[PDB]
Each structure stands twice: as structure tokens, then as C-alpha cells.
């Protein structure tokens, strides 16, 4: 990553689209000393531009990225108590404690705002917060039912890994065509209708007694914070989330078409702290659809007033540990003594 000699596929234009994806030309150390060859390069986001002060490129010959069930068990002389109470206040009164040696197996789903895959509630929809008054604390809303979300990114890339040199291992993406729209997704709404209604129901049966509930979109920040940043197999998807949060729920009473969400695939993500960026460099093949079950909501409340006669709720998140509390909610490792 130094400088990129990029161009655009636009020969006539409307809306000043530019491009998130660009097919570019480069100068590349191949073999020996100081030889180069003309090489294709793609950048997800004209000359230069590069990367900012770090770039790890994952790639690799044999890998992939799909969450795999991982069980957490207690050792010898240790147990794990487990609240099987369907209605838990989170800080509170639990009647049924059991002790398992090992969990059923938890899947490592890295996402924000919605839980994808994950676990469902046994009885009704359950809302959970560390401090229902403190708006800075997250609200893990667990569903008894999944809201659909089908994501088809029909962007196409052909894998070419040129092994020109010993230390060097280079890829080449950006072949062919197909004119795929960005990367695309859908959320299926009937579930979303009943679920959101029931959520405002739970909210109004908890802290919200008599209030009109409104849901505005993300408040702003890093691309991982503004969009529903999740992964479809190692590429980082970012979705405009207005379609999920654009409904004003009337306190008076309740009030085939599917919701289609605009998404983008990224290669350059920022893992860890800033020790380095991570790239999934050769997205292989094309036309890859991931069907998911919306198992969740992570919310932060917009501190409002009482003269507004309404309560506003915004998508929050970021620390995946919240997602694990949303998963590791019924496990606490304990030890036994005579």
C-alpha cells in the first residue's frame, strides 16, 4: 500500500455517484530486485489515497469466516449457575437456579444493532438493561421471534493469486463485470411489524407507561457505528439503517411488500485498537446471499423530555462484549466448597 492509480467505469453519469469500488492499475514488486509488472487492484471506499498508517491483509490460501458454536464449561470443583426464570429483572429475583458443566454451544456472531443467528426467548419478548434510567447504558432487547433479513450482494470478483516472488504473495481481484448494484440486502417486515409493536408494548409495560415511541436512525460516528456493520463471510457490510428505524408508534393504539436495505462491502476494517487494519483481499466468486434471522436489538435511549409526550430510541452498540452479555446471560462460573 503506497499509491493507487485508479480510474472509473463511468462514461456518462447522474447523481454524481463516483464509486465505492474502483478498478485500478499498479506497479508491483514481483520477483528479483526492482522489477515491476502492471497489476489490477481494487479499493473499497483518481490517484494516490493509500491506507492510513497500517494495513494487514488477511487473504490466505485456505480460510473463510463463519461463526462456529463454542461451548463454555466450568472446570473441576466448579459449576455454573443458570437462571431458567423466563422473566428476569436482570439485577434480581431468580427462583430456579441450575448447574451445568458445559453450555449448549454459543456462536460468535459479530454484529451491531440486531442479533443475527443467536438465541431466541422461550416465552415472550424480553427487554433487558443494566440501568433503565441511565440512557448511556445499553438495552439488550431479546426476541421470542426472528425478523427476517436476506442479504444478497451480487458483486463479482474473480480470484487471481499471482505468486511471482518468494516473500511476496499477491492477489488480483476486479475481473469480469455484471454491474451489480453496490451490495444489497433486505429485511422482512411482517415479523418486524409485530415485533416492533410488541417491543413498544413491553416498553410501555415497563418504563414507558403512557408515551408515543419514536425510532430515529443512528446518531453518527464511525462507519461501524452508523451502519449495521456485520459480516457475510469475512467482508464487512455496512447498511443504511433508516429502514429499520423510521416508525412512530402511537401511544393511543397500534398502527406483499418487503423492506430493502442499501449495503456496502468493505475490505479494510479496523480490528483491535489501531495496531492494524484487516483486509479480506480476494472476495472469491460473486452473487453471494446470506439469509439471517433477526434475533435482536441493542438500543440506547435518546434522553428526552416529558413535555414532548414521546420517547425516542436510537441504535447504539459497538463493544461486542454487550453481544456476549446478550448471549452469556444465563451463565456465571461458580466454585464448590464443603
Amino acid at each position, epitope marked *: 500500500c503506497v499509491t493507487l492509480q485508479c480510474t472509473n*467505469v463511468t*462514461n*456518462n453519469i447522474t447523481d454524481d455517484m463516483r464509486g465505492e469500488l474502483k478498478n485500478c492499475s499498479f506497479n508491483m514488486t514481483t520477483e528479483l530486485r526492482d522489477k515491476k509488472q502492471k497489476v489490477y487492484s481494487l479499493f473499497y471506499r483518481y490517484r494516490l489515497i493509500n491506507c492510513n498508517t497500517s494495513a494487514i491483509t488477511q487473504a490466505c490460501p485456505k480460510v473463510s469466516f463463519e461463526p462456529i458454536p463454542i461451548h463454555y464449561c466450568a472446570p473441576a470443583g466448579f459449576a455454573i449457575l443458570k437462571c431458567k426464570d423466563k422473566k428476569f429483572n436482570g439485577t434480581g429475583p431468580c427462583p430456579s437456579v441450575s448447574t451445568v458443566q458445559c453450555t449448549h454451544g454459543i456462536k460468535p456472531v459479530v454484529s451491531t444493532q440486531l442479533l443475527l443467528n443467536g438465541s431466541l426467548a422461550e416465552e415472550e419478548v424480553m427487554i433487558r438493561s443494566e440501568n433503565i434510567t441511565n440512557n448511556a447504558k445499553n438495552i439488550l432487547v431479546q426476541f421470542n421471534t426472528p425478523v427476517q433479513i436476506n442479504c*444478497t450482494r*451480487p458483486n463479482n470478483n474473480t480470484r487471481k493469486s499471482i505468486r511471482i516472488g518468494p516473500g511476496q504473495a499477491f492477489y488480483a481481484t476486479g475481473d*469480469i*463485470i*455484471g*454491474d451489480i*448494484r*453496490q451490495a*444489497h440486502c*433486505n429485511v422482512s417486515k411482517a415479523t418486524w411489524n409485530e415485533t416492533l409493536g410488541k417491543v413498544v408494548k413491553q416498553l410501555r409495560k415497563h418504563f414507558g407507561n403512557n408515551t408515543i415511541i419514536r425510532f430515529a436512525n443512528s446518531s453518527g460516528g464511525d462507519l461501524e457505528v452508523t451502519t449495521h456493520s456485520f459480516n457475510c463471510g469475512g467482508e464487512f457490510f455496512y447498511c443504511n439503517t433508516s429502514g429499520l428505524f423510521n416508525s412512530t408508534w402511537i401511544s393511543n393504539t397500534s398502527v406483499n411488500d418487503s423492506i*430493502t436495505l442499501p449495503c456496502r462491502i468493505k475490505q479494510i476494517i479496523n480490528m483491535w485498537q489501531r495496531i492494524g487494519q484487516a483486509m479480506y483481499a480476494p472476495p472469491i466468486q460473486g452473487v453471494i446471499r446470506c439469509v439471517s434471522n433477526i434475533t435482536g436489538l441493542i438500543l440506547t435511549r435518546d434522553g428526552g423530555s416529558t413535555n414532548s409526550t414521546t420517547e425516542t430510541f436510537r441504535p447504539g452498540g459497538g463493544d461486542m462484549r454487550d453481544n456476549w452479555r446478550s448471549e452469556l446471560y444465563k451463565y456465571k462460573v461458580v466454585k464448590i466448597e464443603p
Partner: antibody
Amino acid sequence: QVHLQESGPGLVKPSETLSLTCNVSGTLVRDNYWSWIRQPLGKQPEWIGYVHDSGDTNYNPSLKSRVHLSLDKSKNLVSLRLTGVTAADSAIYYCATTKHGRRIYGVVAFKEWFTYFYMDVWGKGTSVTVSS
Amino acid sequence: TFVSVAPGQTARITCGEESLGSRSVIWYQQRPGQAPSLIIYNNNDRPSGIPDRFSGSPGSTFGTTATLTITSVEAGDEADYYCHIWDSRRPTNWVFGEGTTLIVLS
């Protein structure tokens, strides 16, 4: 029957303005898109532009500054003017009626939606030689 | 270019660049001494008076060229043929594709 008949001077001097008329019968001009198309000797057709009473009108970019298309509803005709002609503008010129179609997919493919035009009725053509 | 064929046999004519996006191809037939006349619109749709001997290749598989097929060719089919390509990733084409002359060796 829809019937178009082009007329023009046959001969134009270099730098002069070419003025052509397309007389229309069997339909009213306001009710159609009308496209002028040109075809030089021994070459493929080269279109010119399309015009509609609605204002939904567009010109070949290469001819943009030199071309004007009009509809005359009172006389039921379509007109073309092309300024600053040269030998390169020598061709048979045709008046036609231009229909519009859309390629429509799923919303997942919205960026790939597009409109296309096809010329379904042609006149007999008028020959234009720009020479001195 | 040129394509020659015997009466009764099948002729095929290629026109335009390889496809990039989704396509709507228009085909026109022009007889000698006549104005251009059409043949097909919307890749495989025919206007009034055109028989099903004439067919166009779908606006489909990416990176391929549009083709007009004429089955059971007769001497009346001898003419110049032109396409006008609409491709979702390309600018409006203001020039028709280069023509092909069909010769029927009667």
C-alpha cells in the same frame, strides 16, 4: 396509415444551414416521439436526436451545438436544422417515430434499470449533399 | 462485414460490442435502395409483419455479443442489417452498430 415524407434542398453549400421538414400523416405529431436519424453513403445509420412536445428531447452530443429539432402542431410536421455544415454531413436523412421501452428488474438490480428507444416508422428519406 | 448463406439454411449476424450490463438490442433490416426498416426490438420482440424466422439473442450472459438469427433464409432476406445497442453500463449509443450484408446464394 402513419406516413412520413421528408423534404429538403438536396444541395447545401459548406457553412450554410441545412433545413429539413418531415410531413406527417395518419397521426398527430404531439402524440409521438419523433427522431431524426442520419445515414452516410456506405455507412451505418447515424441517428440525430429525438424530440417530443412534452420537452422530453435530446440531441446527439457530437452534433449538440449545431442541431435543432422542432414540432409544428398546426401543420403537423417535424423540423430539423443543422448549422455550419461540411462534407461530413452529407448523408441520407430520415424522419422517424420513436418508441420508448424500459428494462425493469428486481429492486436489488435498480442501478441496472434503463430506458431504450426504437424507431418504428421511417420516411422514404431525403438526400442531402453538402458540396460546393 | 459480410455473411453468405444458401436458401433454406440459417444465417447468423453479429453486431456491437460485448455486453457489459443488461441489454435491450434493436435490430433493423434495410433493403437495397430503401430506407432502413426494422426487424426486432427488446432483444427478441417483433413488430407487425415480421415472421418468427427472425430471432435475437437474449440481453443476457455478460461479456457476449448480440446476434440476429434468421432461419429458413429466402432471397427476400438479402439486405443490410443493423443493430442499435442499449446497455445499462454504457452511454446511449447515437450511432448504430456497424452493419452486416447478408448474401443469399441463390
